Each structure stands twice: as structure tokens, then as C-alpha cells.
Symmetry: D3
Subunit: 131 residues, 6 copies
Amino acid sequence: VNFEEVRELVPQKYPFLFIDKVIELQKESRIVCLKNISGNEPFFAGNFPDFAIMPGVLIVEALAQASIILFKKVFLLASANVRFSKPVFPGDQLILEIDIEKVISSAAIVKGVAKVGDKVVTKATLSFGVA
Amino acid sequence: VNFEEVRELVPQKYPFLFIDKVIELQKESRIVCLKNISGNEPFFAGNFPDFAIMPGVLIVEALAQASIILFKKVFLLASANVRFSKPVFPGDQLILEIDIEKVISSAAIVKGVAKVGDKVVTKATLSFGVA
Amino acid sequence: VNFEEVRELVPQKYPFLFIDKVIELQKESRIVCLKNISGNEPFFAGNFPDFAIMPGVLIVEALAQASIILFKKVFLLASANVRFSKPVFPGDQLILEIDIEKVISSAAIVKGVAKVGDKVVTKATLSFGVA
Amino acid sequence: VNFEEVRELVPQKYPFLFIDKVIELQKESRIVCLKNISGNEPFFAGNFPDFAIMPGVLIVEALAQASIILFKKVFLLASANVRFSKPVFPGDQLILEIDIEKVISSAAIVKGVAKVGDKVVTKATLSFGVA
Amino acid sequence: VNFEEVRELVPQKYPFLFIDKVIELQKESRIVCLKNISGNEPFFAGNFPDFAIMPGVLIVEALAQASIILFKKVFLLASANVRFSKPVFPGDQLILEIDIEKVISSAAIVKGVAKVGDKVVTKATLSFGVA
Amino acid sequence: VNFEEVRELVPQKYPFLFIDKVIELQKESRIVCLKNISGNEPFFAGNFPDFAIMPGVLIVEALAQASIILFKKVFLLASANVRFSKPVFPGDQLILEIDIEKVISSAAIVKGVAKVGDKVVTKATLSFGVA
């Protein structure tokens, strides 16, 4: 899955698109997404202008958009249980791993793991409604 | 506390500032913040261009920035346990209520409630580290 | 009239859309519009970075876009006679009241009143051509 | 007066700076300003995406910022009486002519004329307060 | 050729559109383009905030987009041999002169000359592929 | 060299900063820079909205900013001889290799090679003046 297929499946767009490409797919099982962290992104201007750090809530959004890609292969975040372990900086390559716990007809609960290299930077349990 | 005092205490800035003014303060107890939701904000262009809805993760950030105001009256989100109850639209006036559970020397855990009018739209438990 | 109906009737869009919702309608008589003033709007960065104040000309544009909503329920500002009474700040809720003086086949002249709470911040007489 | 002296005297900045250079100066008498109209300006995206036309209220702001340059050689628009004669498009070179009617200790009233080539596109009478 | 015909022929758009209008056309021979340089363009914020100078690579892009207009009257820059002679500032009117050396079925090589007034600011030889 | 040292040495800033971190340094010999290509960068909206491709001239700017880092360890692009070999897409990791040919007191000529993985995407010879 390339970038044109990302913009098609992810309902968000610039400046709120936080998926760059698709690394590994396993329909109804696991997805591994990739987002490049660049200092030329607009939110780096506004989140701590003294020193560039990626906001933790945007990592949660990146995990949510990756989960949506797994689903469509109208979802909406119903809940999030997140721990922010380590910071992400410009130049980092954020790996987004999504594992489905199990899916019902109107809801889905997933495991979210964000990594830079092999260091875990964010773990999350996300639930989605339908509208 | 006015807007010039908001930009001073909130380390974020545009386009990632999500506090407009300060409604009610109770140092080391409760804060009630206000953020205006306007269709002229940049994220509305990118989050569902078909229909404007405020991303849930940005409400979590608004609750986090309001908690930071309560604290400074270097914090960093360590965890978040959030349920997104109802959507927020352009024209809504987001009320952000923060209640401290209790604070230790190096961490803080708060209750977060986001409201439009009196309908609760987001409830959250947030924890903060120090760096 | 909701926000999706606002973007449909107002020919402007981001970052030059200055109407959030529709409070009161009286076709061919009066309209009462609402615009939320938020510090996260792009023009606040550039208009006096030392202290956030909403430019007066953007209030005139908000009154003009509200008048256009009243009309379509191709107009173009032909003239404006405005007095700027008091400033508007982030967090303010701008009320836009438009009263038609009377409409001819090719022109319209309206009364424009911008309010925060009940304090009048801007009064204007606007005329529109057709193209 | 060059562009670095423009940003110094004009309290506005990007994306609300509407003066590019200074053509002719006559302290306490007349100023002739220049603003380049380019399709790469942010407001052209949002004002009529079907066809690029410069909003009339931004011409009023350009005339106001030019008047401020004449003054400082804390002003704030108190009133504006404007007629919008003809449209301005990307590629146009907007000439801004300001003539002081006369100045008192706490207020100033000026004549504003915006031109492209020699066609008058906007005439205005502006008044300024002090704060 | 007006601005609506520019956006139609130039595949780029905001904030990467660097052609404002069309001054002189000679199909399969010469084109003379116009781009207004304004301090209100987004790249002026980021290229030397101490003093506004237009990046040289954006002049090369303006010459490339002007060459594309000459062609379509799917091209892609294959090579560029450029010398940057003198700087361009806000308020300058950039003239872009393109002369075809000769065109084959799958490639084109042109002469590019950027001028402000009659001073040459950029000379370039550009080649284009097809995809 | 980290990102805070990049913003210090590179005179450009957002939205015209095209260096994320520093991989390998050899003062007065070679530098290897890194820029993450993300679909959330502003120029991707405007360069071919149908399909995201990084403009070739921005790769030249990335090579120029990397050369400036090598130098300061007031330069200005005097000339560029570039061949654009293969496209760069969102998600790519652009490697920027700069080799000094030799430096005189008032000018510098370098070899520029941009790579994604090990595929060469851009080769360039750049010369810099001083002001």
C-alpha cells in the first residue's frame, strides 16, 4: 500500500495526516505503519518552539489512523488508554504497530505500539465506534 | 488570567495552542478553561474535509494544556485514559475542567472533563512527568 | 443552519471564512450570526504578535459574509461605512447582526452590528453589487 | 524605505502584512506605498477558490498599514468609509496613496486611494485612534 | 493568458505556484512570464527571518513552471544548470523569459532568464523529461 | 549534531528548513545529512495534488543547506548544476552527501549526492559566494 492508497483510506488530510506508507499488512490481524517525523511539519513550530518534540497526542492520532487502515482492508475514536514512554524528535522514523484484540459488528479494540528503531515510545489500547 | 498570561504559561504556541482564556482558578485544587472552536482553525481543513469535526486527540491536548496552567500557578504527558463521548463542531465553546487527584514532587494525576454547555463530551485521567 | 450549510452558502473558505454558525434567521429581514474568536486562528500570529487583537477589517468581512448568507436564503462588497468601537480578543464570541435597509434587483444595503455579549464592538453600513 | 524598515514600522506581520515597499514619502503630507498581489498568498486559497480575487477588506488594511507608516515617520483604526470600485487580481501591483486631511494630538484622518496602474480600485477615508 | 488559465496549465498549486500571469507568448519559440514577489508569501517567513530574500531554487522553479506553460500551448525537470546573479526582494516583479533550444518527442531543453526590470538575476538551462 | 544544532547553523527555518539531523561529519572534507520526507509537509499539498512527489528544486535546497552545515563547522548559492535522476515520495528518507572539491577564501564548490537507500536520486555541483 503506497501513499496514494493511504490518502484514499485515511479520511484525514493535511495538516492532520500522520501516515506516510504501509510496511506490513495482515487483514483482520496486525498492521505496521510508517510515519516520517520531519522538522518541516507545521506542528513543530507550535509545540515547544525552544526545542522540537512531537506531541504525544499526535502519536495517538497516528496509531488511530493506522488502525483505520487495518479496518478498511466510518470509524471514530471512542476511547484511548495510552502511556507515553519516550520522546520523538525530528528525523525519527515512527513505526506504528496495530494488533486487533477482536472486532464486533459495531466496535473494535486494538493494541497500539509506536516504535523508533526498536525502542517502544508509545503503547496504547484504542477503541472505535461506528457512525 | 487573560490570553497574554495563557501564552506565557502554556509552552505550546500556534498552531498547537488550545487554550483561549481562564474562567475559574483554585490553585492546587480545580481549573476551568475555555477554548473557542472555530472553523477557521487549520486542523479543520485536514480532519474530514467532507464534514468538520474536532479530532478527539486535540481535546486531550486542550485538557493537558489546561492542567499545565493549573500546575504553574517542566511538565509532560506521561499517560492518558480518555473516553470520547460526543463530537465537537465549529461554533462550540469547549469548557475544560481539571481536578487534581493529588500531586507528588515529580508527578501529578488529574481529572479532565470537557464540556459544551453542560453536555460532557470528553472525560479523561491524565498523568504528568517532569523533565 | 449548521456549519456544512455555512460553507455551502459562503463563497469564501479557509483561511478566510469568518462565520461559524447561524443563530437567528428572518428571510428578507434580519440575520444573527456567530463567529468564535480563537487564538489558534492564523491571523493572530501576524496581527500584533506582542498582543493578540482581531483586525477590524476582518470583523467587516465577517459582517459581509453574514449578509451574504441572508441574501442567499453573486454578491460583492461595493462599499463599507464602519466605526470600530471596542477590541475583540481570543475567547470572545462575536455576534453578527445584519438588518436589511431594503433590496433592489441589483444592489442591497444592510445594517451591520458586531457584538460580544451585549457590548457593541462594530457598527457598519454595507452595500453589495452583483456580478 | 526598504522592506526591513517596513516590518519595523508596521506592527503587523505575516500572514497579515500588506506593504511590500515605500515608493514616495512626504512626512506629515502624502505617502505612496506598494504591495505586490501574488497568487501564492495564503488568502487567495480561501477567498473564492473557483476564481482568485483579492478581498476588499484586505485593501482597506493595506491602506491602513500605509497610513501607519506615514504616521511613524500606537495607532488603531477607529473608522473607515470605503468604496470598492474595481477588482484586484494576482499579478496586479497595488499602489497605495495616503493623504493626511490633518492630524490632532490623539487622532488622524486620511485620504486613501488604491490604484493598479492608473485605474482607481479603492477610495477610502480612514480615521485612527491612539492607545 | 490570465491567472485562471495559469492554474489550469501549471500542475503545481499553492503554496508552490510561482507564476502570476502571462506577458508574452510565441508557441514553440519564447514565453515571458510574471511573478510578483510579496513579503506575504509563506517562504519569506522561513528563508532568513532576519532579512527577506527569495531562495534561488524557487526562481528555478518559477522558470520551470513558465517553461511548462510554453510546452502545453506530463513534463518533469530532468536537469538544471543555473547561475544566481543577484538577489530578489519583496516588492520585486520577477520577469521569466523562456527560449526553447529545440524540442524532441520525449525531451525539451530551454533557456531561462529571470529579470527584475532589466537587471538579469538568474540565467538557467533546463531540460525536461516526460512521464 | 542534533536538531537544535541544525536550526542554529542553518539560517533557513520553517517552512523552508530541509535538514532533520546529521549522520556523518568530516570537517573540511565530507558531510552526510538526513531529511525525512513526510506527506504532512506543506509543499506536498501544492506540488501535484493528484500525486505527491517532492519538487526537485527542494532537493537542491536540501543539498545546499547541508553544504552550509559543512562550512560553518554568510554563504549563498552562486550556481547549481543538477541532474534529477529519480523521484522522491512521502515516506522516503533522503540522504544528503556533500563532498568539498576545494574551498577558497571567498567561494566554495562542492559535490552533492542525494540518495534514498542506496539509489541515487539527485547529483549536483554547487558553488557558494559570500556576503
